[PDB]
Every structure is written in C-alpha cells, then in structure tokens.
Design a protein around this ligand. Structure first.
Ligand SMILES: *C/C=C(C)/C=C/C=C(C)/C=C/C1=C(C)CCCC1(C)C
Length: 137
C-alpha cells in the first residue's frame, strides 16, 4: 500500500544490543545512541520501486531499490553490502544483506506498515533484533 511518508520515530528497542553485535565498542555505542539516534525516514514509493532517505542531524544516506533486484547499500554500522528485498506479505518486505568484502555478523532488515499507521523497521544482526517504530508526519 502507501509506504510513502515522512516518518518520525516513536519506539526503539535493542538498538544498543544491535550495535554491540555489529562490533561498535562500548563508549561508541553509548555515545552513539545519544543526540544522534532519533532518525528521520522519508519514503517515496512508486510500485515495486523504493526511494528511502534516512538522516540524523549531520548524516544522511539514500537507499534505492526495486523489490527482487539486487543493489548495494550500507549495513547499519557502515560496511558496504549487496542487498535483495522480497515481499513476505501484502504489507511487509524482507531484505537479505551480503557483505561486499570482509566477514562479520549476518544482517538483514524488514519493513512493515501496520494497518494502524505504524511503520515498523527491524534490523537483525545474528540473533539480535532491533525494532524501530515510526508514525507519519
Ligand atoms: C526501509 C527502511 C530502511 C531500510 C531504513 C534503514 C535505516 C537505517 C539503516 C538506519 C541507520 C541509522 C544510522 C545509519 C545512524 C543513526 C541510527 C540509525 C538506525 C537511524
């Protein structure tokens, strides 16, 4: 349906846990989830094609994909990867990520629109699941 919107975050869960598995050391994680961990997500959708903009106060990243087509992006912690999004339901999609170079935790993310107006991102590294919940602006 209409994933498109200007999304403001309302709930974070396990974001520091995620960062830990990803290997960001302690002081870095703590300091990280501080004044720059309340992110804005902008979504413009046209069919199976997605344009996404995620930004803090000094950083912004653009993610562009079509469902079913490989692309390149970033892991949550900054490492470049190849990604592929699939649908798992009418309102939910799943992305498997494979690192470009190196090794590290197995990462993935999902994007779901609840019928109640919540946009729900999850990000997974090995067995830790960070859940972010947004509502529109
Ligand atoms: C469909 C929505 C997607 C793919 C959203 C992805 C969001 C991120 C990869 C967020 C990354 C973040 C940073 C790069 C630093 C600030 C903390 C986060 C989680 C907002």
């Amino acid at each position: 349906p209409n994933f498109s919107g200007n999304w403001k975050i309302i709930r974070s869960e396990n974001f520091e846990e995620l960062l830990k598995v990803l290997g960001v050391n302690v002081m870095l994680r703590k300091i990280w989830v501080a004044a720059a961990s309340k992110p804005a997500v902008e979504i413009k959708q046209e069919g199976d094609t997605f344009y996404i903009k995620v930004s803090t106060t000094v950083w912004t990243t653009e993610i562009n994909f079509k469902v079913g087509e490989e692309f390149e992006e970033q892991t949550v912690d900054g490492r470049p990867c190849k990604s592929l999004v699939k649908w798992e339901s009418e309102n939910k999609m799943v992305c498997e990520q494979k690192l470009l170079k190196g090794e590290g935790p197995k990462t993935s993310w999902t994007k779901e629109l609840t019928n109640d107006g919540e946009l729900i991102l999850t990000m997974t590294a090995d067995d830790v699941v960070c859940t972010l919940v947004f509502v529109r602006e």
